[PDB]
Coordinates of C-alpha atoms and ligand atoms in Angstrom, one line a residue:
Chain A
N1 CA 73.3 111.7 101.7
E2 CA 73.1 111.4 98.4
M3 CA 74.9 109.4 95.4
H4 CA 75.4 109.2 91.5
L5 CA 77.3 106.2 89.9
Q6 CA 77.5 106.1 86.4
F7 CA 80.1 103.9 84.3
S8 CA 80.3 102.4 81.2
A9 CA 78.4 99.8 79.9
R10 CA 81.4 96.4 80.3
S11 CA 80.9 93.4 82.4
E12 CA 83.8 94.5 84.4
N13 CA 82.8 97.1 86.3
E14 CA 79.8 95.2 87.9
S15 CA 81.2 94.2 91.3
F16 CA 83.0 97.6 91.2
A17 CA 79.3 99.2 91.1
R18 CA 77.9 97.1 93.4
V19 CA 80.4 96.8 95.3
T20 CA 80.3 100.9 95.2
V21 CA 76.6 100.5 96.3
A22 CA 77.0 98.8 99.3
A23 CA 80.0 100.8 100.8
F24 CA 77.7 103.9 100.5
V25 CA 74.9 102.7 102.0
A26 CA 76.8 101.0 105.0
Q27 CA 76.7 104.0 106.8
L28 CA 73.2 102.6 107.7
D29 CA 74.9 100.0 110.0
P30 CA 72.5 97.8 108.4
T31 CA 73.7 93.6 108.6
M32 CA 75.6 90.9 106.1
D33 CA 72.2 89.5 104.4
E34 CA 71.0 93.5 104.2
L35 CA 73.8 94.1 102.4
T36 CA 73.6 91.1 100.0
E37 CA 70.3 91.8 99.0
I38 CA 71.1 94.9 97.9
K39 CA 74.3 94.1 95.9
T40 CA 73.0 91.7 94.2
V41 CA 69.2 93.6 93.4
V42 CA 72.2 96.2 92.4
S43 CA 74.1 93.2 90.2
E44 CA 70.6 92.4 89.1
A45 CA 69.2 95.3 87.1
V46 CA 72.7 96.9 86.2
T47 CA 73.1 93.6 84.6
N48 CA 69.6 93.8 82.7
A49 CA 70.9 97.8 81.6
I50 CA 73.7 95.9 80.3
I51 CA 73.0 93.6 78.2
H52 CA 69.4 94.0 77.0
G53 CA 69.2 98.0 77.3
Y54 CA 72.8 98.5 75.2
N55 CA 73.3 94.8 74.3
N56 CA 76.7 93.9 75.5
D57 CA 77.7 97.2 74.0
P58 CA 80.4 99.2 76.0
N59 CA 79.6 102.8 74.7
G60 CA 76.9 102.7 77.0
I61 CA 76.5 104.2 80.4
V62 CA 74.9 102.8 83.5
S63 CA 73.6 106.0 86.2
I64 CA 72.7 104.5 89.7
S65 CA 71.4 106.8 91.6
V66 CA 71.2 106.0 96.1
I67 CA 69.3 108.8 98.1
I68 CA 69.1 108.3 101.8
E69 CA 67.2 109.9 104.0
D70 CA 65.3 108.7 107.3
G71 CA 66.3 104.8 107.4
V72 CA 65.6 104.1 103.5
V73 CA 67.4 103.4 100.9
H74 CA 66.5 104.6 97.8
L75 CA 67.7 103.3 94.9
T76 CA 67.6 103.8 91.4
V77 CA 69.0 102.1 87.3
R78 CA 68.3 104.5 84.3
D79 CA 70.3 103.7 81.1
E80 CA 69.4 105.5 77.6
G81 CA 69.1 101.8 75.8
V82 CA 66.6 99.9 73.9
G83 CA 63.3 100.4 76.4
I84 CA 61.0 97.9 77.0
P85 CA 58.3 97.5 75.0
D86 CA 55.7 95.2 77.0
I87 CA 57.0 95.9 81.2
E88 CA 53.6 93.9 82.1
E89 CA 54.9 91.2 80.0
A90 CA 58.7 91.0 81.0
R91 CA 57.3 91.4 85.0
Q92 CA 56.2 87.8 84.5
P93 CA 58.2 85.4 86.3
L94 CA 60.6 83.4 83.8
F95 CA 60.0 85.5 81.1
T96 CA 63.3 86.6 79.2
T97 CA 64.4 88.1 75.5
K98 CA 67.7 86.6 75.5
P99 CA 68.2 82.7 75.7
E100 CA 70.6 82.4 73.7
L101 CA 73.0 84.0 76.5
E102 CA 71.5 81.9 78.6
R103 CA 69.9 84.3 81.1
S104 CA 67.3 82.6 83.4
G105 CA 64.4 85.6 83.7
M106 CA 64.9 85.7 87.2
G107 CA 66.1 88.9 87.9
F108 CA 62.5 91.5 89.0
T109 CA 61.3 88.3 90.7
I110 CA 64.5 89.1 92.5
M111 CA 64.3 92.7 93.0
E112 CA 61.2 91.9 93.9
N113 CA 61.7 89.4 96.8
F114 CA 64.5 91.8 98.2
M115 CA 63.7 94.9 97.6
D116 CA 59.7 96.2 99.8
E117 CA 59.6 97.9 96.5
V118 CA 60.4 98.0 92.8
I119 CA 58.5 100.7 89.6
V120 CA 60.5 99.6 86.6
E121 CA 59.4 102.6 83.9
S122 CA 60.8 102.6 80.1
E123 CA 59.5 103.6 77.2
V124 CA 61.1 101.5 73.9
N125 CA 64.1 103.4 72.2
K126 CA 64.6 105.8 74.9
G127 CA 66.4 104.2 78.1
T128 CA 64.7 103.0 81.0
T129 CA 64.7 103.3 85.3
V130 CA 64.3 100.6 88.0
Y131 CA 63.5 102.4 91.5
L132 CA 63.7 100.1 94.0
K133 CA 63.1 100.7 98.0
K134 CA 64.2 99.3 101.1
Chain B
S1 CA 90.7 89.0 84.6
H2 CA 90.1 85.9 86.9
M3 CA 90.8 86.9 90.7
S4 CA 87.3 87.8 91.1
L5 CA 85.8 84.1 90.9
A6 CA 88.4 81.9 90.5
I7 CA 87.3 78.4 88.9
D8 CA 88.7 75.0 89.8
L9 CA 87.5 72.1 87.7
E10 CA 88.9 67.5 87.7
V11 CA 87.0 64.8 86.3
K12 CA 86.5 61.5 88.0
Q13 CA 85.6 59.5 85.8
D14 CA 82.5 60.6 83.5
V15 CA 81.8 63.1 86.5
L16 CA 82.9 66.8 86.4
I17 CA 83.2 68.4 90.0
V18 CA 83.3 72.0 89.8
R19 CA 84.3 74.6 92.9
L20 CA 84.0 77.7 92.7
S21 CA 85.5 80.3 95.1
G22 CA 84.0 84.3 94.5
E23 CA 81.8 85.9 92.7
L24 CA 79.3 84.4 90.8
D25 CA 78.2 87.6 88.2
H26 CA 77.2 88.2 85.1
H27 CA 80.7 89.1 84.1
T28 CA 81.7 85.7 85.8
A29 CA 78.9 83.4 85.1
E30 CA 80.2 84.0 81.3
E31 CA 83.6 82.8 82.0
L32 CA 82.4 80.0 83.7
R33 CA 79.9 79.0 81.0
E34 CA 82.9 79.0 78.5
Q35 CA 85.5 76.6 80.3
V36 CA 82.7 74.3 81.6
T37 CA 81.3 73.8 78.1
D38 CA 84.4 73.6 76.5
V39 CA 85.2 70.7 79.0
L40 CA 82.1 69.1 78.0
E41 CA 83.2 69.2 73.9
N42 CA 86.5 67.3 74.8
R43 CA 84.8 64.7 77.1
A44 CA 82.0 62.9 78.3
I45 CA 80.6 64.0 80.6
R46 CA 77.1 62.6 82.2
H47 CA 77.4 64.3 85.8
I48 CA 78.0 67.2 87.1
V49 CA 79.4 68.5 90.6
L50 CA 79.0 72.0 91.7
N51 CA 81.1 72.7 94.9
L52 CA 79.8 76.5 95.9
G53 CA 81.6 76.3 99.7
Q54 CA 84.1 79.1 98.9
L55 CA 81.3 81.3 96.8
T56 CA 81.1 85.0 97.9
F57 CA 78.2 86.3 95.8
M58 CA 75.3 85.0 93.3
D59 CA 72.7 86.9 90.9
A60 CA 70.7 86.0 88.7
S61 CA 73.5 84.7 86.0
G62 CA 74.5 82.3 88.4
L63 CA 71.1 80.3 87.5
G64 CA 71.8 80.6 84.3
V65 CA 74.7 79.1 84.1
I66 CA 73.6 76.3 86.2
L67 CA 70.8 75.4 84.5
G68 CA 72.3 75.7 81.2
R69 CA 74.2 72.9 82.8
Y70 CA 71.8 70.9 83.6
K71 CA 70.4 71.0 80.4
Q72 CA 73.6 69.6 78.7
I73 CA 73.5 66.8 81.2
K74 CA 70.1 66.1 81.5
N75 CA 70.6 65.2 76.9
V76 CA 73.1 62.2 78.3
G77 CA 70.8 60.9 80.9
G78 CA 72.7 63.1 83.2
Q79 CA 72.7 64.4 87.4
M80 CA 73.7 68.1 88.4
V81 CA 74.8 67.7 92.2
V82 CA 75.3 71.5 94.1
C83 CA 76.8 71.1 97.6
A84 CA 78.4 73.1 100.4
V85 CA 76.1 75.9 99.3
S86 CA 75.0 79.2 101.6
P87 CA 71.9 80.1 103.1
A88 CA 72.1 83.0 100.6
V89 CA 72.1 80.8 97.7
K90 CA 70.4 78.2 98.7
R91 CA 67.6 81.1 98.6
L92 CA 67.7 81.8 95.2
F93 CA 67.6 78.5 94.3
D94 CA 64.0 78.6 96.1
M95 CA 62.9 80.8 93.8
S96 CA 63.6 79.9 90.6
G97 CA 62.6 76.2 92.1
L98 CA 65.9 75.2 90.8
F99 CA 65.7 72.3 93.2
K100 CA 63.1 70.9 91.7
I101 CA 65.9 70.0 89.1
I102 CA 69.1 70.2 91.1
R103 CA 69.4 68.0 93.9
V104 CA 71.4 69.6 96.8
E105 CA 73.7 67.7 98.9
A106 CA 75.2 68.7 102.1
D107 CA 79.0 68.6 100.2
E108 CA 81.1 67.0 98.0
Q109 CA 82.0 63.8 99.1
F110 CA 77.8 63.5 99.9
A111 CA 77.4 64.9 96.6
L112 CA 79.7 62.3 94.5
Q113 CA 77.7 59.2 96.8
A114 CA 74.4 60.8 95.5
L115 CA 76.2 59.8 92.1
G116 CA 77.2 56.5 93.3
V117 CA 81.0 57.5 92.7
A118 CA 81.7 56.8 95.9
Chain C
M1 CA 90.6 101.4 74.9
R2 CA 88.3 103.7 77.3
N3 CA 86.1 103.3 80.0
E4 CA 84.4 105.9 81.8
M5 CA 83.3 106.2 85.8
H6 CA 81.3 109.5 86.7
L7 CA 80.4 110.4 90.4
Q8 CA 78.6 113.0 92.7
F9 CA 77.7 113.2 95.8
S10 CA 76.6 115.3 98.4
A11 CA 78.9 117.8 99.8
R12 CA 79.1 116.4 103.6
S13 CA 83.4 115.3 104.9
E14 CA 81.5 111.8 105.7
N15 CA 81.9 111.1 101.7
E16 CA 85.2 111.7 101.2
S17 CA 86.9 108.6 102.2
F18 CA 84.2 107.0 100.1
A19 CA 84.7 108.6 97.5
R20 CA 88.6 108.4 96.9
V21 CA 87.7 105.3 97.9
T22 CA 85.5 104.4 94.7
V23 CA 88.1 106.4 92.7
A24 CA 91.0 104.2 93.5
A25 CA 88.2 101.3 93.0
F26 CA 88.2 102.2 89.5
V27 CA 91.5 102.8 89.2
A28 CA 92.6 99.5 89.5
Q29 CA 92.3 98.3 86.7
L30 CA 94.9 99.9 85.4
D31 CA 96.8 97.2 87.5
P32 CA 98.8 100.2 90.0
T33 CA 101.4 100.4 92.4
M34 CA 100.8 101.3 95.8
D35 CA 101.9 104.6 95.7
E36 CA 100.9 104.9 92.3
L37 CA 96.7 104.5 93.9
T38 CA 98.0 106.5 97.4
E39 CA 98.7 109.7 94.8
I40 CA 95.4 109.6 93.2
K41 CA 93.1 108.9 96.4
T42 CA 95.7 111.5 98.0
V43 CA 94.6 113.7 94.5
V44 CA 91.2 113.5 94.9
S45 CA 90.9 113.8 98.8
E46 CA 92.4 116.8 98.4
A47 CA 90.2 118.3 95.1
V48 CA 86.9 116.6 96.4
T49 CA 87.8 118.6 99.7
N50 CA 89.1 121.5 98.2
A51 CA 84.9 122.1 96.7
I52 CA 83.6 121.3 100.3
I53 CA 85.2 123.1 102.4
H54 CA 85.8 126.3 99.3
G55 CA 83.4 125.9 97.2
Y56 CA 80.1 124.7 99.5
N57 CA 81.3 126.0 102.6
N58 CA 81.3 122.9 104.9
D59 CA 77.0 122.9 103.6
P60 CA 76.1 119.6 102.2
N61 CA 72.9 120.7 99.7
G62 CA 76.4 120.8 97.3
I63 CA 77.9 118.5 95.2
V64 CA 81.0 117.4 94.2
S65 CA 81.7 115.6 90.8
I66 CA 84.1 112.9 89.8
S67 CA 84.7 112.0 86.6
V68 CA 87.1 109.0 85.6
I69 CA 87.8 108.8 81.9
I70 CA 90.6 106.1 81.6
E71 CA 92.6 105.4 78.0
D72 CA 95.6 103.9 76.2
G73 CA 97.3 103.6 80.4
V74 CA 96.3 107.0 81.1
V75 CA 94.2 108.2 83.9
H76 CA 92.0 111.7 83.1
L77 CA 90.5 112.5 86.4
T78 CA 88.2 116.2 87.0
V79 CA 86.4 117.5 89.8
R80 CA 83.2 119.8 89.5
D81 CA 81.5 122.9 91.9
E82 CA 78.3 124.4 91.8
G83 CA 80.0 127.2 94.5
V84 CA 82.2 130.3 95.6
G85 CA 85.0 130.2 93.6
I86 CA 88.4 131.2 92.6
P87 CA 88.8 134.9 92.6
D88 CA 92.1 134.8 91.7
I89 CA 93.0 131.5 90.9
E90 CA 96.7 132.1 89.6
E91 CA 97.3 133.5 92.9
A92 CA 95.9 130.2 94.6
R93 CA 98.5 128.2 93.0
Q94 CA 100.9 130.4 95.2
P95 CA 102.3 127.7 97.5
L96 CA 100.9 127.9 101.0
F97 CA 98.1 130.4 100.2
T98 CA 94.7 130.1 101.9
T99 CA 91.8 131.8 102.8
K100 CA 91.1 129.6 105.4
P101 CA 93.2 129.6 108.2
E102 CA 90.5 129.7 111.0
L103 CA 89.8 126.4 109.5
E104 CA 93.8 126.1 109.6
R105 CA 94.3 125.5 106.3
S106 CA 98.4 125.2 105.0
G107 CA 98.0 125.7 101.0
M108 CA 99.0 122.6 100.4
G109 CA 96.3 121.1 98.4
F110 CA 97.5 122.6 95.1
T111 CA 101.6 122.0 95.9
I112 CA 100.1 118.0 96.6
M113 CA 97.8 117.6 93.2
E114 CA 101.5 118.9 90.7
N115 CA 103.8 117.2 92.7
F116 CA 101.6 114.1 92.3
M117 CA 100.0 114.3 88.6
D118 CA 102.0 114.5 85.4
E119 CA 99.8 117.9 84.9
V120 CA 96.9 119.8 86.8
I121 CA 94.7 122.4 85.0
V122 CA 92.0 124.5 87.2
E123 CA 89.6 125.6 85.2
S124 CA 87.0 128.9 87.3
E125 CA 84.5 131.7 87.2
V126 CA 83.2 132.5 90.0
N127 CA 80.0 132.7 91.4
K128 CA 79.9 129.8 88.7
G129 CA 82.0 127.3 90.0
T130 CA 85.3 125.6 90.0
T131 CA 87.2 122.8 88.4
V132 CA 90.3 121.0 88.6
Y133 CA 91.8 118.6 85.4
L134 CA 94.2 116.0 86.9
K135 CA 96.0 114.2 84.0
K136 CA 98.5 110.6 85.4
Chain D
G1 CA 82.7 106.0 110.5
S2 CA 82.4 107.6 114.1
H3 CA 86.8 106.9 114.5
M4 CA 86.2 103.4 112.4
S5 CA 87.8 105.6 109.8
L6 CA 90.5 106.4 112.3
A7 CA 90.2 105.7 116.0
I8 CA 92.6 107.6 118.0
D9 CA 94.5 107.0 121.6
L10 CA 95.3 108.5 123.9
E11 CA 97.8 109.1 127.0
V12 CA 99.8 111.5 129.4
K13 CA 102.8 110.6 130.6
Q14 CA 103.7 113.1 133.0
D15 CA 103.6 116.4 131.4
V16 CA 103.7 114.8 127.3
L17 CA 100.7 113.7 125.4
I18 CA 100.6 110.7 123.4
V19 CA 98.6 109.9 120.3
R20 CA 98.6 106.7 118.4
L21 CA 96.3 106.9 115.6
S22 CA 95.0 103.9 113.7
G23 CA 93.3 104.6 110.5
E24 CA 92.5 107.2 107.8
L25 CA 93.3 110.8 108.7
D26 CA 91.3 113.2 106.0
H27 CA 88.9 115.9 106.9
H28 CA 86.3 114.3 108.1
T29 CA 89.1 112.6 110.5
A30 CA 91.5 115.1 111.5
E31 CA 88.8 117.3 112.8
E32 CA 87.8 114.8 115.5
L33 CA 91.6 114.7 116.5
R34 CA 91.8 118.2 116.6
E35 CA 89.0 118.3 118.9
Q36 CA 89.8 115.2 121.3
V37 CA 93.7 116.7 121.6
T38 CA 92.5 120.3 122.3
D39 CA 89.9 119.4 124.3
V40 CA 93.2 117.7 126.6
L41 CA 95.3 120.6 126.4
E42 CA 92.7 122.3 127.7
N43 CA 92.2 120.0 130.6
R44 CA 95.8 119.5 131.7
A45 CA 99.3 121.5 131.2
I46 CA 100.6 119.7 128.3
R47 CA 104.2 120.5 127.2
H48 CA 105.3 117.8 124.7
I49 CA 103.3 116.1 122.6
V50 CA 104.3 111.8 120.5
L51 CA 102.4 111.5 118.4
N52 CA 102.4 107.5 117.0
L53 CA 102.0 107.7 113.2
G54 CA 102.4 103.9 112.8
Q55 CA 99.2 101.9 112.5
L56 CA 98.2 105.0 110.0
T57 CA 96.8 104.0 106.7
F58 CA 97.1 107.3 105.0
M59 CA 97.0 110.8 104.9
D60 CA 96.1 114.2 103.3
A61 CA 96.9 118.2 103.9
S62 CA 93.9 117.7 106.4
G63 CA 96.7 116.0 108.3
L64 CA 99.8 118.4 108.2
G65 CA 96.6 120.8 109.0
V66 CA 95.6 119.3 112.6
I67 CA 99.5 118.5 113.2
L68 CA 100.7 122.3 112.7
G69 CA 97.8 123.5 114.9
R70 CA 98.5 121.6 117.4
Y71 CA 102.4 122.3 116.9
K72 CA 101.9 125.9 117.7
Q73 CA 99.9 124.9 120.7
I74 CA 103.0 123.6 122.1
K75 CA 105.2 125.8 120.5
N76 CA 103.9 128.4 122.9
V77 CA 104.2 126.7 125.8
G78 CA 107.8 126.1 125.1
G79 CA 107.5 122.6 123.9
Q80 CA 108.2 119.9 121.6
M81 CA 106.6 117.8 119.2
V82 CA 107.5 114.7 117.8
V83 CA 106.2 111.9 115.4
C84 CA 107.3 108.7 115.1
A85 CA 106.9 104.9 113.5
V86 CA 105.9 107.1 109.9
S87 CA 105.5 105.7 107.4
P88 CA 107.3 106.7 103.3
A89 CA 104.0 107.8 102.3
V90 CA 103.9 110.2 105.7
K91 CA 107.1 111.4 105.7
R92 CA 106.8 112.0 101.9
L93 CA 104.4 114.9 103.0
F94 CA 106.2 115.9 105.8
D95 CA 108.9 116.7 102.9
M96 CA 106.7 119.2 100.7
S97 CA 104.8 121.5 103.1
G98 CA 108.9 121.4 105.0
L99 CA 107.1 120.1 108.4
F100 CA 110.6 118.7 109.4
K101 CA 111.7 122.0 109.6
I102 CA 109.5 122.0 112.6
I103 CA 108.6 118.6 113.3
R104 CA 111.2 115.8 114.9
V105 CA 110.7 113.0 113.7
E106 CA 112.0 109.2 115.3
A107 CA 111.9 105.8 114.9
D108 CA 109.7 104.6 117.3
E109 CA 108.0 105.7 120.7
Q110 CA 110.2 105.1 123.3
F111 CA 113.3 107.4 120.7
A112 CA 110.0 110.1 120.9
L113 CA 109.7 110.0 124.8
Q114 CA 114.3 109.9 124.7
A115 CA 114.5 112.8 122.5
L116 CA 111.5 114.7 124.9
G117 CA 114.1 113.9 128.2
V118 CA 111.5 111.7 129.6
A119 CA 112.8 107.8 128.8
Ligands
LIG1 N1 67.3 97.9 80.9 C1 66.6 96.8 80.5 N2 66.5 97.3 79.1 C2 65.9 96.7 78.6 N3 64.7 95.8 78.5 C3 65.4 94.9 79.7 C4 65.7 96.0 80.5 N4 65.2 95.2 82.2 C5 64.9 94.5 82.1 N5 64.8 94.1 80.4 C6 63.5 92.6 79.6 O1 63.3 92.3 81.3 C7 62.9 90.9 80.5 C8 63.5 90.4 82.0 O2 64.0 90.5 82.9 P1 64.8 89.3 83.5 O3 65.6 90.7 84.2 O4 63.6 88.5 84.2 O5 65.9 88.9 82.9 P2 67.0 88.0 82.0 O6 67.7 89.5 82.6 O7 65.9 87.8 80.8 O8 67.3 87.5 83.4 P3 67.9 86.7 84.3 O9 68.3 88.0 85.7 O10 67.8 85.6 84.8 O11 69.0 87.3 84.1 C9 64.2 90.6 79.9 O12 64.5 89.3 79.4 C10 64.7 92.0 79.1 O13 63.6 91.6 77.8
LIG2 N1 86.8 124.5 94.8 C1 87.0 125.2 94.6 N2 86.5 126.4 95.3 C2 87.1 127.6 95.7 N3 88.2 127.8 95.8 C3 88.7 126.9 95.5 C4 88.3 125.8 95.3 N4 89.6 125.0 95.6 C5 90.6 125.6 95.9 N5 90.3 126.7 95.7 C6 91.2 128.0 96.6 O1 92.8 128.0 96.6 C7 93.5 128.1 97.9 C8 94.6 127.1 98.0 O2 94.5 125.9 98.0 P1 94.6 125.3 98.7 O3 94.0 124.0 97.7 O4 96.2 124.4 98.3 O5 94.5 125.1 99.4 P2 93.5 125.8 101.7 O6 92.8 124.6 101.2 O7 94.0 126.6 102.1 O8 95.1 124.5 102.0 P3 95.6 122.6 102.4 O9 95.1 121.1 101.4 O10 97.2 122.5 102.8 O11 94.1 122.6 103.0 C9 92.6 128.0 98.8 O12 92.7 128.8 100.2 C10 90.9 128.4 98.3 O13 90.3 129.7 98.2
LIG3 MG1 68.4 90.4 84.3
LIG4 MG1 93.2 122.1 99.8

């Protein structure tokens, strides 16, 4: 079973997005915690795409895929935005490039602790992809 | 545009109490940041008490806005205390290690006691 | 100004509820009424069901694509279909007409879509796919 | 939801089958209803059906379909079908399909049972 969702990069769509995701995954009858982590993770990755990948420019589009299979939730968040120069560096706990916007640099760390896997692929000026598995 | 997170504010002497209801995310944390920094400019606030009792959700944007508010309170020699924290939220305070810099209390009376207000 | 959402999903009947609810959620940003929302959800369900029962014959490997482009208070909705199509579209546009009577279909689908939306444009080429554009 | 998104309740009052619905009635869900109802009609000699839509949250053309299919079943045995506790949303669909010309509507279960000479 699979679902795909795109939407303009407006902060006003963030709640809708993670709720949509949680609604589709609910078919695996998860726990409130299991759901809570997923929604948080989605919120974490989608927010990255909007503020970093598009620099809060709504004309941008966030793409979320959710392929479910054999009890496994294969979640992917993509953006054809700015891309990430040093990924080995972004993956550094407490690292951020937007301290003016009070971003704490906890994103990937959270995604890491909530998901059994996190693969962040990216090329500069092309955009990005973050794959999570649970 | 506020029904995704309701923000209740109240100033008690030199203490600002912030009670949250709803979800605390990117969109939402930005509105909180605005109302709070605003109160900080208009009033001489030394301490902040963040009541998270009715909070439904929080992401790294929650930490961020809290961390930014701590640095503001740190500057005036103040303390920030969060109370009525749910497990889910407490968990995030554990990763960021936000606890090393933010005191946690059962709830709003004990937060106020820690701030010598009661 | 505008905001847009796109949703694709496997052609399974367990996703239908999900899809119309999702669309209704996005549309909710225009603070509609319960009736306005109900008509849209009914419409979404009508078109999505068409794609699933009349494009992919209940077969799940198919994909339904919904697009919701909102602008200046207007909801521009669209549905897709890389499955079997409509050989006599105009004839399908005839009240009560149905290919599936063994599946107890009543031929209301379009009649409902026309009465709930200010506009309904159905484009289609056989074996290619089907695309229903709705406006409100 | 495996009947969550719906919830079907059945009761036979002599030769009458009462169907009480709670939830959404769409393609997925109308198929399950069809399955349970046709199943009861095979196992019992049912002459009339009363359909309580009081707790119905939603309905699409999939809802009309399963209703007419049931009426034709009831029609041949010379029976009557009555729907009750119909919301405006749902009443509206009965008006387009013109399902009314073939299905009697009532305010509540008791009036539907009175219409079938049961009460
Ligand atoms: N989609 C993206 N496009 C471009 N750069 C990205 C993207 N996602 C993350 N980054 C970069 O990776 C760094 C990492 O992540 P984190 O996710 O920890 O960042 P923050 O957004 O700075 O932190 P927080 O989650 O606390 O707001 C960011 O500071 C940003 O520079
Ligand atoms: N996506 C599609 N692909 C192929 N044929 C389609 C598609 N959508 C509609 N049709 C054709 O249009 C005819 C009519 O429409 P409606 O949509 O009114 O049909 P039903 O599905 O027969 O009716 P109801 O909605 O009452 O169950 C159908 O019987 C079908 O043959
Ligand atoms: Mg982030
Ligand atoms: Mg149809």
